[PDB]
A paper describes a structure:
Interactions between HAdV-11 and CD46 are well-characterized and clearly depend on the fiber protein, but the mechanism whereby HAdV-11 engages DSG2 has been still unresolved. In this study, we elucidate the molecular basis for HAdV-11 recognition of DSG2 by resolving the structure of extracellular domains of DSG2 in complex with the HAdV-11 fiber knob protein. The structure shows that DSG2 and CD46 engage different HAdV-11 residues and interfaces without overlapping.
By playing with the stoichiometry of the two receptors, we successfully obtained a “super-complex” composed of the HAd11K trimeric fiber knob with only one molecule of DSG2 and only one molecule of CD46. A large data set of HAd11K/rDSG2/rCD46 was acquired by cryo-EM, and the image analysis shows that there was a mixture of different complexes in solution even though the molecular ratio of rDSG2 to rCD46 was optimized to produce a ternary complex. Indeed, the HI and DG loops of one monomer make extensive contacts with the SCR1 and the SCR1-SCR2 interface and the IJ loop of the neighboring monomer interacts with the base of SCR2. Key residues for the rCD46/HAd11K interaction identified in the crystal structure are similarly important in the cryoEM structure such as the salt bridges and hydrogen bonds between H43 of rCD46/D284 of HAd11K and E63 of rCD46/R280 of HAd11K.
Numbering used by the authors:
A (entry chain E): 1 to 126
B (entry chain A), C (entry chain C), D (entry chain B): 129 to 325
E (entry chain D): 100 to 337
Amino acid sequence: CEEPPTFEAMELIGKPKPYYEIGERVDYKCKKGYFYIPPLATHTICDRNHTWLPVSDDACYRETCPYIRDPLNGQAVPANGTYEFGYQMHFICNEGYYLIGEEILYCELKGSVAIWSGKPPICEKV
Amino acid sequence: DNINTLWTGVNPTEANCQIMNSSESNDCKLILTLVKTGALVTAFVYVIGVSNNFNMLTTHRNINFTAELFFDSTGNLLTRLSSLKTPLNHKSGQNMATGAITNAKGFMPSTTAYPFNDNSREKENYIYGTCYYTASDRTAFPIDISVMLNRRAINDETSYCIRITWSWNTGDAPEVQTSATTLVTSPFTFYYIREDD
Amino acid sequence: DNINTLWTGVNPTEANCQIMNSSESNDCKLILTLVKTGALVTAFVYVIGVSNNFNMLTTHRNINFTAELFFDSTGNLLTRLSSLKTPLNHKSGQNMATGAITNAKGFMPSTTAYPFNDNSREKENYIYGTCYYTASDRTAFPIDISVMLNRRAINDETSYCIRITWSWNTGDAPEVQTSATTLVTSPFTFYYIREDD
Amino acid sequence: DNINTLWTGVNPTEANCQIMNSSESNDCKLILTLVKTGALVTAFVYVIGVSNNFNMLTTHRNINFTAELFFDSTGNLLTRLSSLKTPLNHKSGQNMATGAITNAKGFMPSTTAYPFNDNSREKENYIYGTCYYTASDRTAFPIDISVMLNRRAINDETSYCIRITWSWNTGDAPEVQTSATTLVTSPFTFYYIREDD
Amino acid sequence: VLDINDNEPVFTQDVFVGSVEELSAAHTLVMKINATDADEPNTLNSKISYRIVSLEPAYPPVFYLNKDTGEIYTTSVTLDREEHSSYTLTVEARDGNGEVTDKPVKQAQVQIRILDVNDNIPVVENKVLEGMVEENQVNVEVTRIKVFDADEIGSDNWLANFTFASGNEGGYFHIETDAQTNEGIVTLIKEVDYEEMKNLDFSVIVANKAAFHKSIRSKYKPTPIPIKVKVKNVKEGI
């Protein structure tokens, strides 16, 4: 094999080598900001075909931000229907109330931690 | 040879301690372990909030709550008076073993080091420290811990007493209404001279 | 009966840990000792700076560096993933014993007390404390230590994890360009419930 | 199996330590316990004031006082130079045992981890912490503790050294003239690597 | 014949009154509420079930009324007198089932006063303090210093006790405490010669008359507040 595959959310461990003998095993590690869930494998072996046996980055899942409860007299909703980072959260105030804080929050990955871009707003009576 | 340990067990399934007497239907889960180290006992204590009224404390600026453990002359927990409503026992894996307690008295605070009803040595009956609360924004929040060892007996059965008071008094609460999830305090480790077996 | 200790040894001859991701080769000397005390494990950790870049960290006002230790199902350290690049072993004098580890798993953090990928119990996976740095002027500069236990895995082999993050963020750095000699941290001792042998 | 403890006994009848350099006729009661925990030693130390001059320290806003323990090649205390004026012995109930000490050397600070006359590893000979003093009005005043381990030997006999320095610098004295009763320090527990048996 | 809940418990007084100290621990008896009847005691229709109908200001939940005993305690939410000086409670007593029914029952008012403890360090609002001493003048107010404390107005926890950190070893200045506004009146009690050019600046520390509470003691850092003193150059003549 002359090319250990590259993936979006999982990085090879160690310095890549130009060539690996048949049977050599290469292990990966889930990238900074992603975390492993079993039972999918995160390693591969160079077969007799000079092709790496099938392996995918489905083992690692994106880091998620803390859960937010609905503001009093309000309603929070995952803008993209989940909590993984790089996504946003929307807030809506009921008919009889108005929003006072940030309308939309963005959950961003700082280093290895996903954090919300601010604090949840509140709804105030009109 | 696990008899050196006496603990509540790791993550009990159901709440095993009532801290707030204002509530019923035990409102918390107290993880307390005591391990013999020669002439000392190392105590490893923390609390997991279960009830809504307990978990809502993180939303308040000023808080104080105490866990009281009264042990009889044989070293067995007085469940009726104690905040911890389940007996302590030896380590059997990650749980509590079932059977008689092997030298419970050895785990009790020493009466000589920590006496009863003696004002002249009152100051010897206090231990202090700090634990931490992990907030939603991942910023650690310091919580003061005061441990009083067998200073005052309540009735004729109380032979040893441990009162662990968690408290905090700051300007801003650790959490807000829409972020508070559960009150889990970082483990607090302290030491005390132990009564003879 | 030295099997109750799992440590790096006392002052290893050569640097055994690589912390700075910005650097290559080992840059410091991580002294880590785990003692099995009944139902707990006492961890005793500190760092001795070796590389010039690592030692120069004392000149910067806001710094944080993390030592990652990953252990497989048998409790053996995963060298390629962990910052420490030499396996721990039992006590033999002031050096590491040579041979298979007798029940390494027993020294690993308990999965029940400290779970994996459980968002409802995240707060249970954190410990905090303070260590100290002895400045050139013999004053103690405080350093914050955050220990994260086996919350998140990174591959199919990592079964336990200890992340020890040293940090400080102050107006003035502990040292200046001309006084920086070596970066060593006062020992930090913490405790955690241990997985069954 | 009490040979794992080396202490001064729980509340000795008569004072057994001379701290204040300004007085003689040893003036305080230093309770010290050393417990062997695998490859470490747990040191559990506090001081109970006896003489009036010591107990009057609480009426001052800036105090420091040091206990120096010097140990020979066999780990036996040098009663002539050490602040403590009674040999340490093993646990026998709440009192010291009578007889030769069984492997005293194993309790001493390790020369390898903590060396003599080495300005490159000076920073490795310091440990730091905090204890508390309980006032009459139930106020816990924090007291800084610095432990210097076997860095400098005054004479030929000294093979190991432990210098425990208590200090506080507060705003208002913890006590007044009519309120000081005794200067009891809340227990302080630290750890150090122990010399080979 | 079986006794029935045809009547209601009679409160021993229309307006119950008690008090509790600020920063009091959890589960300290604040009051006891008393009510009785004329039925057979220790029965379903005679056991008195107390219930808090309402609490002004209702937040935080700082009090707890035991239904079986009628004694009002504090709870884990520690009191803070500065946030709320007093609390009002509308309470009621019932029997039989002991639950809230459509039929109303007599209600009583319970007024709980929070007793102030010295849990706030005074601060000096003025940042630039400078007097102007007239030469060779005795018993003259040199200047004033503003002190603020959030504790109860008029109590020993609010009045400021001024002490001289330094700069008055010559016994020149004395500070009185104006309790009307909790201020420090710095006055000169000795003659000063401008030719001597006596360097009259000093530094003082501010503290409440009563001793500080255990919650803030051991955290008190007495930062010296300097005050600069100028001496007038009186033109006696040439």
